[PDB]
Write a protein that binds this DNA or RNA. Structure first.
Lengths: 58, 159, 222, 51, 172, 185
RNA sequence: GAAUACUGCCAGCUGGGACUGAGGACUGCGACGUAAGUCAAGGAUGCUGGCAUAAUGGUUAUAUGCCGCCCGUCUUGAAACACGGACCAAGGAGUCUAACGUCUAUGCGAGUGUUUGGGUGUAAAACCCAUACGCGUAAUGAAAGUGAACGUAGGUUGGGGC
RNA sequence: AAAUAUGUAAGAAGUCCUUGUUACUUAAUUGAACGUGGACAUUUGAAUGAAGAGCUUUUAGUGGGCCAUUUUUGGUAAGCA
């Protein structure tokens, strides 16, 4: 008829057998949620930087 | 039935401090947050907009976005057996700079200055911090400090 | 002119200079130890004469032995025991005494017996049970060349150099201690001296800081 | 092929640590200590004898 | 832990920039070894002052040997102990040749008569009684009479063998 | 008893031999086992490990990819090394004279390389000419271009290809894929 | 002015007992030596005796000491006063197929698949083959439709190998 | 207003100097973000450990639980829930 309702027993042991892992950050994170005005201008800024570097390196 | 609304179990955690109610002082709004700044999250109960969920009270994260009246914060949340990245749009009333990171930044400046002086004289300037060491030998003088002998005291009722 | 004795004489000569270096360093260590101990003795005597009390410098080195089995251990002390490399009963390691490691010792107190080892204890321990961690393998020391090959970049050229780096907690104590494989001691030859091990040494048991009697315990365990 | 214990087997004991022969020849394990006639202060004596 | 020695333990609070040279408190502690003696020192210093082991330091520990360890002495001891239902103060008299041996007898006697474990006993004071007529317990007084002499009736002799051939006697 | 901090008797998880029964591949493995033990060049170890890989772990390398690699500065005269198959590419119309060492050449790739004045050679010829991998350039094909990789990590908002047999309208383009029909992913 | 106890140290000496003798040319580190050499120094040799067979040993039966509840199953928990099983022999249960996923081996490779069929044959085999067709080489949209190089097929960070 | 428990940081994806890009921002050659060049081993910025580290694919069984210390709810209580 009636059974157990809930328990967190053994759940931390399960979670730690394959460890609790960190999200593995990167250089250059994704511009998700970054302000559209900011990243719209950032595109043109990077484009100009690349063009000037190419001109300087001939 | 059970109840798991957005602000459930926040009765005391979203209190204002005792005799610290009312208008937020302007230092909160005069603060400047940059992407990469590390901030603490503490919800102000009098500003109901841009308010964090109760899980993030006391969490410390990194600013990833700056808007008109808010900052985006990355927070690592443990879900199951791994950590997930969470992005929070929080009004500046609910955050503050991390004093730990402040002191780390001046520790970086002090380290650079010690290295610059050690380049002149005193190489190997021991930049790394060390734990508290065991104490060295010492002479303790009895002159004017004759030891006083103590003993346990008998039991008394006090009533 | 087959280049057998030509190279053997060169190798034997190099070994001769290595042993001359080791001989002079061990003699210098012996005078340093004698001067130290005689100096603390006379410092105590002179403080008595002057009417003062000489407070000895606190100990810099502890030897810790795991005395409890591997079953039914809470996660935090289990993790600390793993980080101290005490993963089986009667295993022992040296720990440099700082606040960071003292809190670990507090945290694993009910499962270990520790104390401050003497030079005799360290020397016998490293001579009898000293094993090097070379390429992830447990290698019996048994020769000074092994120590020179794995620790000579820190100036440690002999088993006495290694012992010196242990006893006086030197600049490269971390590397020397980590090079030392965790000591696998036996059960004490005349027993534990108590009916029940798992009380504090202060309460008539075995675990905790028994600071100077750790030498007696380890001699029986060695 | 076999670990040979120093602290016995004087041959291995001397292969390691060439100083051991000098130690055992000068009897450095039984070094006679110098004589000093230092006397503890009277205040130390009364403090120790107190109560 | 009744291989008792006596130690003087002197310690203090750790010197500070505002308060160098603290007041150097001293205790007399009966214990089996120096580790237990220092433990007892910090236990009593915590219980009487606001000084714990973390904020202080042991300046000296010295074993005190009995000055005349081979003359019979009358000792008065004051103890406080914890029973199952309260704390009590007690005074006892022990006739013996040294302080440590008197205190060993005290611990054995308190265990025997009051089931008071070492944990539960504070030795307030141990002092030699200078002269007779200050002894107040009859079990010590009766051994202080003139020309004392008594027999030991019913001697029981140890037998090393399982069987004896003689049906032994208890004369003495 | 010992408080194990890691799984016991754990195999390294890397192939130590080719799974294949090709006797000629095994002879190549014997050669590069000797070369990787008796030389200190990391090139020989890299080639030895590459000789163990499976078919999907040795994707084909096109001649266009070889020409693009030889386009790099200072790479014009290097020996291209492909531990796998070199295939032909008709998108590219000009080839330089070059030397390519590979396990296999397609008939078209071999003809195009030879016609360009180059030479196709086996890995043992490479070992004889360049025992330490002197002046070589190891090329590897694109692994994640495989069609099976399209479906790895399928899930809501993950943007992966569903495993599906027939394609078109009426095949999983409805409720779950657009807001007008329930929700989108 | 000394002794002694207690504690500690010796790379102090030495007697008795037990278990073990792994390896199999040499190579090493050393020690003693004025050297030649010797050695307890990278694992036992030397000398001697009896027997040479049921003596040792194996197997088996029994006795003795101590231990040992009946398997299978469901179950949190079975020796269970839970169920099936008196015994034995023989039979007795994850197969084949259509269409598929991942991985692996093989052939060929921008292609690939001969076997529907035709040719042939030593005849259900083997061998040979045209035109198609399937999948792949293009996607996307409900559809009408449109349809993949600014550039060294881009910039940046890392990246084995060279 | 504890104890225990809990978030973050302790650096090269760093710090500093100079000056380049932008359609954002500034009253402004002000900033913001990203950079070109240049200067930074005894310790590259606390301890201890690290058993190799990181990553992927695919699939089994399971999804009746129960017991002990400590915290704890209902119940007089329970080998109760």
């Amino acid at each position: 008829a009636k059974s157990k309702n809930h328990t967190a027993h053994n759940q931390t042991r399960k979670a730690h057998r394959n460890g609790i892992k960190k999200p593995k950050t990167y250089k250059y994170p994704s511009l998700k949620g970054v302000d559209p005005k900011f990243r719209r201008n950032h595109k043109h800024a990077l484009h100009g930087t690349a063009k000037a570097l190419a001109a300087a390196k001939k | 039935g059970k109840s798991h609304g957005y602000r459930s179990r926040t009765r005391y955690m979203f209190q204002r401090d005792f005799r610290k109610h009312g208008a937020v002082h302007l230092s909160t709004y005069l603060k400047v947050y940059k992407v990469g700044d590390i901030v603490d999250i503490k919800a102000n109960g009098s500003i109901q907009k841009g308010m964090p969920h109760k899980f993030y009270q006391g969490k410390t994260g990194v600013v990833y976005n700056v808007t008109k009246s808010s900052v985006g914060v990355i927070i690592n949340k443990m879900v199951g057996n791994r950590y997930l990245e969470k992005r929070l749009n929080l009004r500046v009333e609910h955050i503050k700079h991390s004093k730990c990171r402040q002191e780390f930044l001046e520790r970086v400046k002090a380290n650079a200055a010690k290295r610059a002086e050690a380049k002149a004289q005193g190489v190997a300037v021991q930049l790394k911090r060390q734990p508290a060491q065991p104490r060295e030998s010492r002479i303790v003088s009895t002159e004017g400090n004759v030891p006083q002998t103590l003993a346990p005291v008998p039991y008394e009722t006090f009533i | 002119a087959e280049q057998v004795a030509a190279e053997r004489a060169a190798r034997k000569a190099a070994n001769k200079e290595k042993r001359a270096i080791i001989l002079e360093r061990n003699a210098a260590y012996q005078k340093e130890y004698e001067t130290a101990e005689r100096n603390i003795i006379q410092a105590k005597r002179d403080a008595k004469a002057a009417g003062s009390y000489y407070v000895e410098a606190q100990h810099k080195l502890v030897f810790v032995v795991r005395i409890k089995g591997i079953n039914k251990i809470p996660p935090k002390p289990r993790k600390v025991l793993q980080l101290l490399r005490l993963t089986r009963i009667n295993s022992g390691t040296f720990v440099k005494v700082t606040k960071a490691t003292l809190e670990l010792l507090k945290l694993i107190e009910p499962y270990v017996a520790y104390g401050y080892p003497s030079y005799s204890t360290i020397r016998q321990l490293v001579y009898k049970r000293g094993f090097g961690k070379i390429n992830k393998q447990r290698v019996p020391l048994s020769d000074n060349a092994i120590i020179e090959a794995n620790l000579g970049k820190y100036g440690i050229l002999s088993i006495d150099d290694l012992i010196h780096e242990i006893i006086t907690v030197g600049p490269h104590f971390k590397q020397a201690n980590n090079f030392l494989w965790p000591f696998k001691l036996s059960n004490p030859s005349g027993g534990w001296g108590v009916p029940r091990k798992f009380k504090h040494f202060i309460q008539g048991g075995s675990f905790g800081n028994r600071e100077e009697f750790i030498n007696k315990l380890v001699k029986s365990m060695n | 092929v076999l670990k040979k214990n120093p602290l016995k087997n004087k041959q291995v004991l001397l292969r390691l640590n060439p100083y051991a022969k000098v130690f055992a020849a000068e009897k450095l394990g039984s070094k006679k200590a110098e004589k000093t006639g230092t006397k503890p202060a009277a205040v130390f004596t009364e403090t120790l004898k107190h109560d | 832990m009744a291989h008792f020695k006596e130690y003087q333990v002197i310690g203090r609070r750790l010197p500070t920039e505002s308060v160098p040279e603290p007041k150097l408190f001293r205790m007399r502690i009966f214990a089996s070894n120096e580790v237990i003696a220092k433990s007892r020192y910090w236990y009593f210093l915590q219980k009487l002052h606001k000084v714990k082991k973390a904020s202080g330091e042991i300046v000296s520990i010295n074993q005190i040997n009995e000055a005349h360890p081979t003359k019979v002495k009358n000792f008065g001891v004051w103890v406080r102990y914890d029973s199952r239902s309260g704390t009590h103060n007690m005074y006892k008299e022990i006739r013996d040749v040294s302080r440590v041996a008197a205190v060993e007898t005290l611990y054995q006697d308190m265990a025997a008569r009051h089931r008071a474990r070492f944990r539960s006993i504070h030795i307030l004071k141990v002092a030699e009684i200078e002269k007779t007529a200050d002894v107040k317990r009859q079990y010590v007084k009766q051994f202080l009479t003139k020309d004392l002499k008594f027999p030991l009736p019913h001697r029981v002799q140890k037998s090393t063998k399982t069987f004896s051939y003689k049906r032994p006697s208890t004369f003495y | 008893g010992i408080d194990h901090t890691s799984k016991q008797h754990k195999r390294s998880g890397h192939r130590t031999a080719p799974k294949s029964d090709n006797v000629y591949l095994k002879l190549l493995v014997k050669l590069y086992t000797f070369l990787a033990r008796r030389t200190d060049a990391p090139f020989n170890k890299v080639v030895l490990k590459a000789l163990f890989l499976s078919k999907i772990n040795r994707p084909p390398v096109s001649v266009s990819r070889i020409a693009r690699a030889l386009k790099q500065e200072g790479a014009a005269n290097k020996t291209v090394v492909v531990v796998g198959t070199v295939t032909d590419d008709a998108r590219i119309f000009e080839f330089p004279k070059t030397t390519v060492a590979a396990l296999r050449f397609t008939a078209g790739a071999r003809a195009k390389i030879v016609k360009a004045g180059g030479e196709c050679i086996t890995l043992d010829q490479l070992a004889v000419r360049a025992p330490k991998g002197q002046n070589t350039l190891i090329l590897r094909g694109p692994r994640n271009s495989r069609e099976a990789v399209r479906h790895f990590g399928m899930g809501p908002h993950k943007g992966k290809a569903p495993r599906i047999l027939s394609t078109g309208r009426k095949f999983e383009r409805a409720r779950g894929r657009r807001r007008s029909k329930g929700f989108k992913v």
